[PDB]
Amino acid sequence: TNKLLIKNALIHLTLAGEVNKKEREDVFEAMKEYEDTNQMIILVREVNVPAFRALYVVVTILVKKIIKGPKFLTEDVVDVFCRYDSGGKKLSKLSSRTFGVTTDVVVLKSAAI
Amino acid sequence: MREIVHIQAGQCGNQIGAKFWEVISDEHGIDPTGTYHGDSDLQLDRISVYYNEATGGKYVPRAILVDLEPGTMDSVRSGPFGQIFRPDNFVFGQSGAGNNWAKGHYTEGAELVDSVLDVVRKEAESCDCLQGFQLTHSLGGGTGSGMGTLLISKIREEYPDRIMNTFSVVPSPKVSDTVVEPYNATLSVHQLVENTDETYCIDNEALYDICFRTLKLTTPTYGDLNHLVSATMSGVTTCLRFPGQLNADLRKLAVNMVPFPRLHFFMPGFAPLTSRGSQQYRALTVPELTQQVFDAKNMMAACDPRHGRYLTVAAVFRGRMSMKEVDEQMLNVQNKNSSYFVEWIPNNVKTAVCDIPPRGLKMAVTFIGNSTAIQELFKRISEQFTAMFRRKAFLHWYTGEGMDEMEFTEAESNMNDLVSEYQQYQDATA
Amino acid sequence: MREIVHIQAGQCGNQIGAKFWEVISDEHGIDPTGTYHGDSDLQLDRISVYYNEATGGKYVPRAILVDLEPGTMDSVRSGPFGQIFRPDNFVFGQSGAGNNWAKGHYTEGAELVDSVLDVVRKEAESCDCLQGFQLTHSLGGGTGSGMGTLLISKIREEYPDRIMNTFSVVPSPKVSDTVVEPYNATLSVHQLVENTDETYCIDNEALYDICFRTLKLTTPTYGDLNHLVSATMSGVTTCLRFPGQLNADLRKLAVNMVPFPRLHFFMPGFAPLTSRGSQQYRALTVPELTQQVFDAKNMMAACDPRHGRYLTVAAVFRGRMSMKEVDEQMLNVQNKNSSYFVEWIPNNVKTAVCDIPPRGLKMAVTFIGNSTAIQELFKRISEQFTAMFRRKAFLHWYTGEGMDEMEFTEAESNMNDLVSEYQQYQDATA
Amino acid sequence: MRECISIHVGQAGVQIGNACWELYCLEHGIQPDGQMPDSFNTFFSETGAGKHVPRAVFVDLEPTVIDEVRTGTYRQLFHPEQLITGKEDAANNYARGHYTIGKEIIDLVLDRIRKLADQCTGLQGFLVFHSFGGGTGSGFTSLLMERLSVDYGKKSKLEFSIYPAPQVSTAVVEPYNSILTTHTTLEHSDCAFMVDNEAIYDICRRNLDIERPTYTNLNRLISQIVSSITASLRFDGALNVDLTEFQTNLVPYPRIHFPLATYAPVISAEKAYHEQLSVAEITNACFEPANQMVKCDPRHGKYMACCLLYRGDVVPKDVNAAIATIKTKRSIQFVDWCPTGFKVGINYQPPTVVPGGDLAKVQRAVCMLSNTTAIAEAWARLDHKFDLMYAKRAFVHWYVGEGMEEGEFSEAREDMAALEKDYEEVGVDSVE
Amino acid sequence: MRECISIHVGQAGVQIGNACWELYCLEHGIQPDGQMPDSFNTFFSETGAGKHVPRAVFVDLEPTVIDEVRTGTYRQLFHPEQLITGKEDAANNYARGHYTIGKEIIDLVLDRIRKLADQCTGLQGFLVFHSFGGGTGSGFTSLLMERLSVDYGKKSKLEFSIYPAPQVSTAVVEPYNSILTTHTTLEHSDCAFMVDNEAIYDICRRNLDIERPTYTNLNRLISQIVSSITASLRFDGALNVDLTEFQTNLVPYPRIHFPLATYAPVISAEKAYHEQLSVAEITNACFEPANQMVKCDPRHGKYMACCLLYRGDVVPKDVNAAIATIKTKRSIQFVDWCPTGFKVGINYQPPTVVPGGDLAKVQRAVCMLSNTTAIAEAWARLDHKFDLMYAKRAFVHWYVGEGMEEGEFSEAREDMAALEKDYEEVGVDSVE
Ligand SMILES: CC(=O)O[C@H]1C(=O)[C@@]2(C)[C@H]([C@H](OC(=O)c3ccccc3)[C@]3(O)C[C@H](OC(=O)[C@H](O)[C@@H](NC(=O)c4ccccc4)c4ccccc4)C(C)=C1C3(C)C)[C@]1(OC(C)=O)CO[C@@H]1C[C@@H]2O
Ligand SMILES: Nc1nc2c(ncn2[C@@H]2O[C@H](COP(=O)(O)OP(=O)(O)OP(=O)(O)O)[C@@H](O)[C@H]2O)c(=O)[nH]1
Ligand SMILES: Nc1nc2c(ncn2[C@@H]2O[C@H](COP(=O)(O)OP(=O)(O)OP(=O)(O)O)[C@@H](O)[C@H]2O)c(=O)[nH]1
Ligand SMILES: Nc1nc2c(ncn2[C@@H]2O[C@H](COP(=O)(O)OP(=O)(O)O)[C@@H](O)[C@H]2O)c(=O)[nH]1
Ligand SMILES: Nc1nc2c(ncn2[C@@H]2O[C@H](COP(=O)(O)OP(=O)(O)O)[C@@H](O)[C@H]2O)c(=O)[nH]1
Ligand SMILES: [Mg+2]
Ligand SMILES: [Mg+2]
């Protein structure tokens, strides 16, 4: 999997600090019964400010829903397809429009909302 | 134009203000006498924002000094930068407050208010265009919490459409250097939230760690704590009185910053803060000046910013730099702190740049926070007020000086409503 | 770009690194202050692989110095090349581990660990593009085996897609300078085989013979054992920061080298090693530097290379030479050692050439071995572990510091599985 | 002959004007003192004595940047009755620049324009320089378009509006000053230009290798674009364009009049070599997302109409060669109902370099002006800020107690609600 | 005219090109600063000002060797947008040059090529220089033949692959980076040249009496061979050959397109005397095992289609006399089905000596590009190295954890399983 890439990104870019300690501790154990799933991706509202809205899984081609947000993902509704950089805790924008083994950070579209 | 009258108060602010005019006279090259020795002619282009000019090229600080004992006023008049003031402006009584909000507002405050407001009226006529009044006091004592909040309940009566920034040195959480500071604060916040547009709430305990951890000192005297506070006091209004690439004043730092008519409690911050020998190990760059600011250990208010969320953030810079570096770094620290910023205010980073650094540095940031991180500061005061009211200790010094017991229940339900607005109208994210 | 953060820990790793930064300052022409005095501008091409560049042209090492008592920290700060570091980096405790793996990982290490990882986080953001982390410690002691392997159980939780080379000065076979070093090592190899990509294991006994036999010295001080170790630490990364013909880095010296995800325990080797007066008896040539390397009496790990077999071989050369002589001699030593290499890996010699020699010589070779000949190093420790656990000597210092007796059963079948994987997957020939 | 006056509202207008009126003095040999060592009689009504003075009004409410003009390099150039100061700024309060303070000095500005508007007879157009951010650049244009479209009405008016960026923000009520002015400036403007803050930094970093630019250097790249709209009023050309022509060629409806500028070539002095700069080369540089000056993907929407204001030694056949390449391409897709929406103007003067400036000395240039569909996303942005900063009624009491009814805010979104549907209306194709 | 661009993937592609682009500047009088004190319009899209800049794309993932080009002798020559750097190399990992890092800047290369293919209309071919060793070399190339054979498709494409040497080796996964790229580069290349590292040391030691060569002096011999293929484009000859003519005569089947160079005279300066250099002398020098730049015995297998590219002072009668000797000789045995598989190109210009170089100034040269059968043993070699490094699953976890299925490794040998049989399928003689 890429389990250390998402779990590091949960408490350093998306849900970080004393404010949302109710929030992220609720969603560690929600994906504890999961994460044997070979890939999980997160959702981000804007590339301007990376904030958490949805944690998703990819079960082997269909994106299931887990804990707010839509249920299935297509190539059309998602604007960018990014990669979590570990060195500077920012978002590496991948050039691949489709899915991949590596990508985790996605941003939806206001036309899909 | 756009003059500022600098009303002082209390034992605290008169020793802050004794250091603040030491800061301002050096930026404009002013001696202890009152003449001019500055290098840049850009100094005297806006010397009339603080300094009325008199005969012989002398300048006087537009400053009104208020006390109830002749104690600190005798110290400042004999101290350095003491002869520069006007001997008419020194207003003082003889009874002395002596740590009593009941005395500083009714017993002695409400008898020597007209020896002050006439001198205010003299200086409002000295103004070409009245901009706003700044007051320097403390919620802890008796004079600065009693006489100041009487004058704010008189100035907005008389000058209702001018901005009123107050400095109130908030009592620290751990040590209590006043036994009735839960009674000199709660009876002042009631008077400040209805008649002040902005209040630069500054703690003490957080200001010692900056002297300990960051400056790396051993013996922090008050001459090196107010020295750091007056660095921030001039950092607000320096964008007014100097040419900048992106200009700002007291009003632009009021309109962009106050969303609701009650939530106007600011927690400042300053950078760079070097050491004496460790000054030559860090790079003096805009990505380095900003990352110093947005931590917790360089907030002058002793409350955790990671508890509670920011609403509006001002970053008044100084010095000459590159605007892309600023616009990049106001994003880069907004990317990683995006969990801390609030949802329903997008692009909540106000920016302003000057073109003159402080005298000796190369570049400097002055930070003006506004968070829900100060909800536990008032939760602390409203809980110390709760225990001392149930035993009703220390009550006979107030009731005997003309004050009712329901007024202590008025302010406690007042502040516990205001703590809820940092919780009701914080997490409303539609 | 491609920055390297140099964490130091323990008493040993700090004294190694205090000689290693003496090396790097001299290749790049850095004074004791931190300014520049080098001759060739090729030093400053990749000067940002180890150095945050501060103001005034000064450079500071990207170095984080960790200890649990200020004994060695007071030595290095008052020693030579001591002022070059950052006084923010010197994070240290007060209690001291004192030869106790259970103290430096649970008791004292697991309380002041977040005072280190903030400065680690601060320097990863100082990077332009993070390449990897090099830790310098020793398995024998308490701090370098307890505090260090705690940090690898934190950094891989934080920086999982980077490379983590460690130097761990292994206890020598014959003499033991620590009573419970069979307990400081077996509880550390468990914390290195799952979390480090490569590990340059160094024995002590082999490093005394080279000072005795080949260098021909009488009194080998630690200032001349680490001096021979620091010649190798800057023998690996010198292809990453200098323009060579066939370039290699910290990653190409990991992908070509580590066939299975567990067998990453290396044994270095340096040449030429002259004497003080016997240098004028040998021709300084490429067929002469190679034949010095592949013997037994110039391996820094005290294990007989003829016992067991190599899997892979890396021979990082330095200095300017001819690429046929390299291609010939790497063939030639595989002719005569054709029974000492392994069958099922053909062309098992990785080679790279730099174009700048060490300052003063003409050419130098940094050999990076990899063999099954380190199976008896672990057969030695896990047999010393076996008797001292049967009588369960020295057990109450660990049980009383937060540890169960099952952990000595976990780590014992751990290493006895590792020795079998140098025997199960050694003689598999097809 | 034909004369046009310039108005500089707010700080962003004045500091741009400090860069414009440096450039026009250099393009004609005009000294900073108004001296010079006949086509330039459009911007400079001269004295009978030997001195040219500009046709400029620098209105401002705070006296900070005006005193930097009165003490700057161009002290002697201006007539000091033009430089109009004030007392206290509107200070990012929209009702403090349209109601409270700007009403006090509205007679001094209009009467000073009234003296300039009867200095000649070819009163051509209006150049207004302002932003949308602050309280003057959008709070005093909307009053000054209210007056000058009642005094004159039948003229042509140009607004060079600095656009509020999607990423970079130096204000907090930055959407509480654009929706308020678009209630007013929509139905009385002619052609409002959009220039973005963010998209110039991508052009200053990548295409110039300047990593640390300044607002000195951003304002040069807007002064060059302004000096190519009015290039034909100052120089003889093959195919001249007029300010009375841009209202006709580029405004297909009484609502949609929002073009986004585009300039080429933007390359440094060291990269002024190494390429050949044909007009087949410099035209394809304009039609890429690498050279946009609004942060929008142009390959999302469709170009309705375009324009190409070439200048320098340009061969008019190769223009016709370079255009015919474009319309037969895959990515560039116009709207179906427009036959072909180009409009080409060749002028005979190369752009002049500024000393100590960024740009190299090139021979040919282009100021593409494009009224495209894809700015609708940039208008969908500043409704979403109004969607969230108004359900909680943030920052409203600074507006209500300054001569402004807060029932107007539910009305001004319906202005923008219709305008977002109009780009969706025109962008689809009328079948049958 | 007829223009051909050159892509230099990997370090070995760059360092060969560092020796190539020294030679084209000398073979035309071009200074290193792009100056000169009409046939050279095939690699040098010149400026209108006097400067010639090469048609070359240098791509690399690690910034080391690019900074040696950006500080070398040819600093001023290149257009600096061509020099595409990266951040961190693929580092002998195939799935780090095709999935992880190569996908980052694949649009930075293709869009930069996109602004070169629209500089001339005679887009002739491609010259991808790359090795098989490194992670960039055969890992970023196989993505680029994927992309350019979908953009262009119908063009002609040429590789110059530094072959992994049979006995000497400087990597460990060097038999992994070739079997993985041959799954990808086979169905998109059209003539992939094998040049061996080991066989050049046999020529530099023996035929030159230079005992200590360098990669400076092994690249000179590959720079002379590339300047013997494109010599007919750059000069006038009696019997010219073109880069569409190589792909027809040399590819007898859509799989087998693996030729190997050969070059005579490789002799020193002291032995430039003592013989006579007739074209019947040096022709037999090409057909010796002592002048084979792949370490294989040519007298084991057969030649399917040789090709001789003479140049300099060459008389075409003696060529026909030299060929008439060869087909009657005993050891050289062609294949039965081919009638006669020669293809001769006589050119006029001699090879020019490089100053400080190895070779003498000779009058004539030959680049025998033989497509032989005997390279099948060299493909039988890298199936033996694959299998003993796959039954133990050596080095697999550095591939699986970088975006690569480990079921694919049982398939790329099945690619080579058919291709090993095809040489044995064609090399036999069809009876009846
Ligand atoms: C006049 C002259 O040329 O003197 C030489 C010298 O004579 C010899 C004998 C040196 C010398 O080495 C020793 O005496 C020695 C003593 C104890 C342990 C190791 C070495 C030399 O000290 C060492 C020194 O090496 C360096 O300067 C390298 O840069 C080296 N630097 C250090 O080790 C170093 C020493 C002190 C302080 C800081 C650094 C190095 C090697 C590898 C990687 C990085 C740096 C050299 C060439 C010289 C002297 C001075 C005598 C030799 O060693 C090295 C490492 O170069 C020993 O055999 C070589 C051959 C050298 O010719
Ligand atoms: N292009 C450009 N924009 C600028 C420059 N300086 C400031 N701006 C923009 O100006 C906008 C702010 O508008 P202002 O006119 O200054 O505000 P105002 O309140 O109306 O006027 P003042 O308060 O009197 O300065 C911001 O969006 C800035 O990006 C500059 O040099 N160039
Ligand atoms: N003929 C020749 N071969 C070279 C030269 N430089 C390197 N090589 C060969 O290149 C092979 C190594 O693979 P490379 O592709 O060059 O490595 P790289 O291009 O740096 O790729 P990465 O480092 O993995 O990104 C070895 O066989 C070297 O002998 C050179 O100048 N000439
Ligand atoms: N920062 C700062 N705080 C001060 C100083 N002097 C007093 N204080 C604080 O002021 C509070 C006491 O109030 P004080 O002003 O002296 O009493 P008052 O004269 O009745 O207003 C305590 O919290 C003190 O720590 C000073 O010079 N600097
Ligand atoms: N090579 C080398 N080994 C050292 C040095 N100092 C200590 N050691 C070795 O380190 C081991 C003791 O560990 P130590 O690091 O001092 O204890 P710790 O501080 O608890 O990690 C012994 O095997 C020593 O021989 C030194 O300077 N050089
Ligand atoms: Mg302004
Ligand atoms: Mg490489």
Author numbering:
A (entry chain W): 634 to 693, 730 to 736, 738 to 783
B (entry chain H), C (entry chain G): 1 to 44, 47 to 360, 369 to 440
D (entry chain A), E (entry chain C): 1 to 37, 47 to 441
Give sentences from the paper.
At the molecular level, CAMSAPs/Patronins stabilise uncapped MT minus ends and support MT minus-end growth. Previously, we showed that CAMSAP/Patronin CKK domains preferentially bind to a zone behind the extreme MT minus end, which corresponds to a region where the lattice undergoes a transition to gently curved tubulin sheets. Using this, we determined reconstructions of MT-bound CKK domains on both 13- and 14-protofilament pseudo-helical MTs, allowing visualisation of a wider repertoire of tubulin conformations. The reconstructions show that both NgCKK and HsCKK form an intradimer interprotofilament wedge, contacting both α- and β-tubulin subunits in a tubulin dimer pair (with constituent monomers numbered α1, β1, α2 and β2).
We also investigated the CKK domain from Naegleria gruberi (NgCKK), which does not show minus-end binding preference. While the structures of mammalian CKK domains have previously been determined, our NgCKK reconstructions now reveal the near-atomic resolution structure of a non-mammalian CKK domain. It has a typical CKK fold, but sequence differences compared to HsCKK are reflected in structural differences in several loop regions. The NgCKK N-terminus forms an ordered density that is associated with the surface of β2-tubulin, although the density was not sufficiently defined to allow accurate modelling. Furthermore, there is no clear contact between NgCKK and the β1-tubulin CTT. However, NgCKK MT binding is shifted relative to HsCKK, resulting in a modified interaction with tubulin including even smaller contacts with α-tubulin, contrary to our previous prediction. On the other hand, in NgCKK loop3—which is one residue longer and positioned differently with respect to the MT surface compared to HsCKK—the residue equivalent to R1528 (R678) interacts with loop H10-β7 of β1-tubulin, possibly hydrogen bonding with E345 (bottom). In addition, instead of interacting with α1-tubulin, NgCKK residue R686 (equivalent to R1535) also interacts with β1-tubulin, extending to within hydrogen bonding distance of E345. Intriguingly—and in contrast to the HsCKK—the intrinsic protofilament skew in both 13- and 14-protofilament MTs was unperturbed by NgCKK binding. However, HsCKK forms different and more extensive contacts with α-tubulins compared to NgCKK; the looser interactions between NgCKK and the α-tubulins suggest that sensitivity to tubulin configuration is thereby absent and explains why this protein does not specifically bind MT minus ends.
